[PDB]
């Protein structure tokens, strides 16, 4: 690793600086170096890792969608043949996205998940595993497409099972997991009814538990609850 010679604490400090500078590729490389030191991550450090890669892959996905749209239009009836360039460049972006997802999944498998015993860490990492398989699924077309979808489903389902046993229904990680597993059902698994049921049940069970929270916890939980409602509004 090009980060092997840098102190763990200095990698963490630089990831925070890269975030303030909106340099998310650097942020991700610093956090990859920190993970590769081999020690478990704290709650704040897991946040830095997830923010960095979410921003990197989010930009890649937005670019891939622009390029896929152009490519689909070029394959319509009456379109002038522009040659292989649109497909090639969509493939270039796709391969770079797949590379980032494989990197994150590699960090989770070697060895973040196996050392994560507390619900707050284990659910967070298994949600991330479902998220990055989901991004692989968004671009998948080959023999392994169903297996990529099932890998996402399996990781999300293990996270859900732990979160229901070990976390209150307002826990922001539990809420965000349910938000994203619901989007998996709607966009990836062609299961809009399951997506809507999960978002609604998650919202209602959180609502009933808000009374237990402090003002600051209430703010955190209701922010994610509003994202569930936003999706329900989009889908109904």
């Amino acid at each position: 690793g090009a980060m092997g010679s840098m102190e763990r604490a200095s990698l963490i400090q630089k990831a925070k600086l890269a975030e303030q500078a909106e340099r998310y590729e650097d942020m991700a490389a610093f956090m990859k170096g920190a993970v590769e030191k081999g020690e478990e991550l704290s709650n704040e450090e897991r946040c830095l890792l997830s923010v960095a890669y979410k921003n990197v892959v989010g930009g890649q996905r937005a670019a891939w969608r622009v390029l896929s749209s152009i490519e689909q239009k070029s394959n319509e009836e009456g379109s002038e043949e522009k040659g292989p360039e649109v497909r090639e460049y969509r493939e270039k972006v796709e391969t770079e996205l797949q590379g980032v997802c494989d990197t994150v999944l590699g960090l989770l498998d070697s060895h973040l998940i196996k050392e994560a015993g507390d619900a707050e860490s284990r659910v967070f990492y298994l949600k991330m595993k479902g998220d990055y398989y989901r991004y692989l699924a968004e671009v998948a077309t080959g023999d392994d497409k169903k297996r990529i979808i099932d890998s996402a489903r399996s990781a999300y389902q293990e996270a859900m099972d732990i979160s229901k046993k070990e976390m209150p229904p307002t826990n922001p990680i539990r809420l965000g997991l349910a938000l994203n597993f619901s989007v998996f059902h709607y966009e990836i698994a062609n299961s809009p009814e399951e997506a809507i049921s999960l978002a609604k049940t998650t919202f209602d069970e959180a609502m009933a538990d808000l009374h237990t929270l402090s003002e600051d916890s209430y703010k955190d939980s209701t922010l994610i609850m509003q994202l569930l409602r936003d999706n329900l509004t989009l889908w109904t």
Binding site: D131, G176, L179, N180
Partner: peptide
């Protein structure tokens, strides 16, 4: 697109 976190 729908919201994720």
């Amino acid at each position: 697109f729908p919201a994720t976190v």
